[model samples]
Target: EPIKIMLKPGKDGPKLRQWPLTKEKIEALKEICEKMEKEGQLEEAPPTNPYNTPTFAIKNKWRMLIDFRELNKVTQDFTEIQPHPAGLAKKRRITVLDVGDAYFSIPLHEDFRPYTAFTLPSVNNAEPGKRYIYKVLPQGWKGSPAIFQHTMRQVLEPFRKANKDVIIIQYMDDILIASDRTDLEHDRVVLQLKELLNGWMGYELWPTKWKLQKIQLPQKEIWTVNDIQKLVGVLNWAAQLYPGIKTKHLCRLISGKMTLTEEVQWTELAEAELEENRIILSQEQEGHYYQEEKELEATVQKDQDNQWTYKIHQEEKILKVGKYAKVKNTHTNGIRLLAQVVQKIGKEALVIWGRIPKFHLPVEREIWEQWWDNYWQVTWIPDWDFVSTPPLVRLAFNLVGD
Candidate 1:
């Protein structure tokens, strides 16, 4: 029997845009689709099919998955299934039977196949090729796991009924068999499970280490593994294997005061550029705050009907500093700006850490104070808004709030 996708009335699958993947990844996806095609998991969808979405794979291994959001939205959920009960507390020798056939083992109904279609990107251009759909249930589909479990339960119901003493735990593809009797009772059950028909971890450490070397750091962007904390983490993961491989003084070099790169030299041009960039940024934030709050207000007419519009929205966003990125222009200005907020938000800004007399305007201070004093003073007084300048830790907290 094939799997079915019952949809809500008047609802249909959406054609989503393809995720931007590199050429290598696209080629990898093609190869993965080829396998899926050969195995009859998926088939060639018609050219005129309206349903569409994206599928993904990497350059290395075949970890292919479809972007199933569009299909799932319209499809109704079914199956009498619980999350799982993997029998953790059970005693004695337990053998795992992995049903490696996965979701692809279950066929999808012919009429519903078009709803699973995904477009393939062309090798040469910005454009993509025709859509293809799965004949069998795809791994990422929401109902696939539930349906698969239902089928498995139906398949094993008789065996489970006969063996009252044996514990049968089914979780997706992995089935756990725990037997109470110390003898060959577990062996008998497993062989019986084979009669029901069949099934499927990590010893690939060396290639994984090689995989670590191939990680291309984002040269002008972010690398999650390039930071001092992450480097220390890598060293930690490797510490158990052989600490002596790159030991002693080399360890001292990496953690010394902790910069991402090996070295950072502050040449004269950089120092000059720091102060210059500071003044340039300061001039950009003109008239953001007013002496009186009402002058910053806007006029609004009475509303009848309107399109989707949203202006006033508040959010607590935590923007972080550069992890491994080196500074070429300003004197690490991003950090300097964060430091400015740590102490005060005033009419003029002061980054005493920078140690410049003329460059000592805490402009953020003005913008912040002006907002509170002019507008917020009338509407609602902020809880921790008015703390004195240079007020030690209190100033720091206020700055963080801003």
Candidate 2:
């Protein structure tokens, strides 16, 4: 008879050194989850939520997926995914690496047991007691990613203490590394990484096996994360954990009150709106309100057929909602929108709160008739363009579109 290999959750064959199931490790995992939730590092799905999107703990590109086979089976396509500016750097050279075998290296707490997804009858046709129950392994098993993260955190502790701007990112086992300017800084960062990994893994790096690249810089830079150059890579990894949440929401919990770092508490309304928008983004505007209401207008001044190329500006304004009750920058004007609309075809603009733009110019109040002079209008409309003044161009407009 042939010896068969059986799989189980929380199980590692003798070939893989067993990490003891411990209370300490389990508690640590729970505590980490609590911290992540409190810090808005995890995104909870709404309603009867059983899952969450990993946030601050990991960048938006890398997602720490859940093995929600059961949940996925019952779950309708609740939402769609949105592409973010993770790789906004527009660099060709990228670097990616994995912790040879992460979890296996860590010391498991006494009470921690791996979460298994599958139920099996037996292996090699053994009897009940001898028949091993096959347990399913999940990607987001509650402890694995957290434990691995802590391990990486510990490994990077020295550099962190030094306050070096090394951008270390994760999605389960994979890591994306970057430095600000991508020169000597890059080399120093890789050296730090290699030193940490070698110390942790107890082995030398196999140069032939690793994929490392220099991050190319733009002629004029907008923004950059030192140590990690591939924004797209980061984004792809972030999506691996939370499926449909927007990039803005992903970072919302980092600082302010709306941030949740304790347990995954979700707002059904917010979830629904973001999910819907993501779907719309993927499918274009088909069947969406703007498409259906015919609010969308377009004039091709620079259509391929037309010799002159045309590009227009769009602007909108809305109250700052969510965890932030009042935005500090608004006080100068005390409001978000402060511009007139420019009616140029091939240019489209819509406002959140769905309010129409009124390009009314400011007039010296008949100091006394300010209230009654609603009928007296000033013909001069202030110029509205990027050059004129910037308006409140919010990322999540649906919130204000009410």
Best by lDDT: 1
| Clash counts for the predictions, in order | 12, 51
Predicted candidate 1 versus true structure: per-residue lDDT over 91-201, tens digit per residue? 354555545356688888887888888877776665657468988876656567676776677767878889867767653334556566544766777778866865421
Which 10 consecutive positions of candidate 2 have the poorest summed lDDT? 128-137
Give the alpha-carbon lDDT of every model: 0.44, 0.29
User: Among all windows of ten consecutive residues in candidate 1, which has the lowest summed lDDT?
Assistant: 347-356
- lDDT digits (tens) for residues 1-402 of candidate 2: 111223244433221111221233333444544443454333222333222211111111221222222322232232221012243122222244545244444443321212122111223325321101112112333234454555577877766667454445443344545445445656566666777777621111122322222111122222223211222233333243224424444233222333222322335553454455456333431221322222222211211121211111122111121111232443432111121112211011211111122232222223212221112111111121122111111211112211
Q: Against the correct fold, how does model 2 do in TM-score?
A: 0.25
